Nucleic acid binder design. Structure first.
Lengths: 136, 88
RNA sequence: GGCGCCGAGGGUAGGGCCCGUGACUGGGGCGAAGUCGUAACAAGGUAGCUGUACCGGAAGGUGCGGCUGGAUCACCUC
RNA sequence: AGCCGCGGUAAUACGGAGGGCGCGAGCGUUACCCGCGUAAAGGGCGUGUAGGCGGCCUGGGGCGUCCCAUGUGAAAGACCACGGCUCAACCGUGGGGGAGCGUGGGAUACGCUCAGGCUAGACGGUGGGAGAGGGUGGUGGAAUUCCCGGAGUAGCGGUGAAAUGCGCAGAUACCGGGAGGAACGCCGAUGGCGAAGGCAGCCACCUGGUCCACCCGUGACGCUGAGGCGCGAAAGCGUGGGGAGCAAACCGGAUUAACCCGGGUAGUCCACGCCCUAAACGAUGCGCGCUAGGUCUCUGGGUCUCCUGGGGGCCGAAGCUAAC
RNA sequence: GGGUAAUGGCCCACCAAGGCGACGACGGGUAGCCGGUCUGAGAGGAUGGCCGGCCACAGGGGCACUGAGACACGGGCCCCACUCC
């Protein structure tokens, strides 16, 4: 069972149907993830909520302006959201082997040796980690 | 025809403490009681395959209940297997 | 120099593998127009699909059982 | 060369000429290299082991991974610059780099190992519900076959025809009773249950699986899954054995010049054992968890503009153009 | 225990007991391995007689002297097939 993938998935299906928010299982490693995608713009932000004593991490799906012409469905922000390094197929890389996000327009969540950072934050501090997932 | 009152005895027999009605020992205990009952059934209804399947279900489940208590605490595991007459 | 063993031949018996050839058996593909015959009887139905048993030189046929499809104002059955 | 394809009186290499591309000699033929399943590709299905991956919180050691330092793996050779023949294939000189290995130090997020705590998966407890789950033991009716008794009797049972059969008798459609066996209507319904098969007159007993509710307890003891083990309609095969219906080989009429109809034994049947394919279905690469999601009809539980768990019909997003 | 490259093999003797694997060999077939070369940028497959290093092969098979190292090489000895005298 993969908690991360299952999480990033909800985020996707959340935008497809065009919802205001989506609840997810509260987790430390997940919190940081959602936190980063919020500092960039992929998501409007998140918040902690305890449902019947159960902690969650409902996130706010952010959307861009209106389409070019008479058409509802606002312009999406997260055009994609998959994971690379996952159970079974562990995928690790070094600072000199760091991947390449979608032409800067996005971030590649890397579980470096200095906390959950991105492709650049890792390149700068010169640290490598695990290819959590690439968002764009 | 049984299985309705005798449970209280079986449970309170393997109950590690007053109120315990589902411990690893209890689960296996009550589960074993079912296997014995089912076993006494197939011997009469050999042409009964369905229930025969459920037999391996509890037997397979029971063994799993054993291996667990084994790697977690082989102390109670040796006792439960003895109090149940399982492989003396 | 002599004796014995470690070694390796050869010979005998049994089994196996590879290569080449002969009386002879069965099946299949391809080349194309032809010989002969014809399963869907040229379709609600009929029929067909899959499998096994029996039968025939062959075309195949046929019974049982499990599914398709078709269809109108008309159920499938031996 | 490979492929589409050309000629039978014409487009071109069916032949040749004029023409054209490449070319420093050339060009040519031949031999060697370079994800996905609803309809080619579903195991028959199920229980499980290896194995691999494993919800939440804190901490420690610390491997894997990442980084830094040193040395070798050299040279050769590739890359960069320069020189010498100096146009190059070349050669020569210097330097940079790389993955990998060994030693030492640091790092900790995730994974890995371990300890104390949580359970939002499952199991167990209590209280309930639905179905042909399976097996065993009884019980009831229609219909079919045969005999006797009553009666009548020349025609009837059948296809569009007819033959066949009925012919001890007095048949067949009539009435009542008796013996045997098999299959078991209306309700059975886009239904339901079960591991698959398969199972549906009803009733009792043994027994399995599954759903729902309050929500205590033990505590992810998990999920899938190759061998192995058990097992599928009809079917053939061995032994014991009774009866009935139907029925392929068989027999006959007809048609023809055939499968429809009639009779019909072997046989099919029940139980044990052996055997166990294509199934079904296409919702099967298995399968699990989460996630999106409205209305209508139907099923089960507690509630009652509801929710959990199935089936069918019409969608929206998205996927697949190639079933639209 | 003998012998030597100086104990990890190997040869002889004795007692006990199994060892290895499916995260896949004992057997069959071809290829020598690597740096490296070409396709290439993809690094996957394939090939390797020339260049350098590391191994095996003296017509074949076996043993062993030689021997600091020139140690199963050259060469020598024996047998089989075969050529010449």
């Amino acid at each position: 069972t993969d908690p991360i993938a299952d999480m990033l998935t909800r985020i996707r299906n959340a935008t497809r149907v065009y919802k205001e928010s989506t609840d997810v299982p509260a987790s430390r490693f997940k919190e940081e993830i959602l936190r980063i995608l919020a500092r960039e713009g992929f998501i409007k932000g998140y918040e902690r909520v305890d449902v019947d004593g159960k902690p969650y991490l409902r996130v706010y799906l952010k959307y861009g302006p209106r389409r070019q012409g008479p058409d509802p469905r606002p312009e999406q922000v997260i055009h994609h959201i998959r994971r690379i390094s996952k159970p079974g197929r562990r995928v690790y890389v070094g600072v000199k082997e760091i991947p390449r996000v979608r032409r800067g327009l996005g971030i590649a969540i890397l579980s470096t040796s200095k906390g959950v950072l991105t492709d650049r934050e890792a390149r700068k501090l010169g640290v490598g980690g695990e290819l959590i997932c690439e968002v764009w | 025809p049984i299985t309705k009152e005798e449970k209280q005895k079986v449970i309170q027999e393997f109950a590690r403490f007053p109120g315990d009605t589902g411990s690893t020992e209890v689960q296996v205990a009550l589960l074993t009681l079912r296997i014995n009952r089912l076993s006494e059934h197939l011997k009469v209804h050999k042409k009964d395959h369905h229930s025969h399947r459920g037999l391996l279900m509890m037997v397979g489940q029971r063994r799993r209940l054993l291996r667990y208590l084994q790697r977690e605490d082989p102390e109670r595991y040796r006792e439960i297997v003895e109090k149940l007459g399982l492989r003396g």
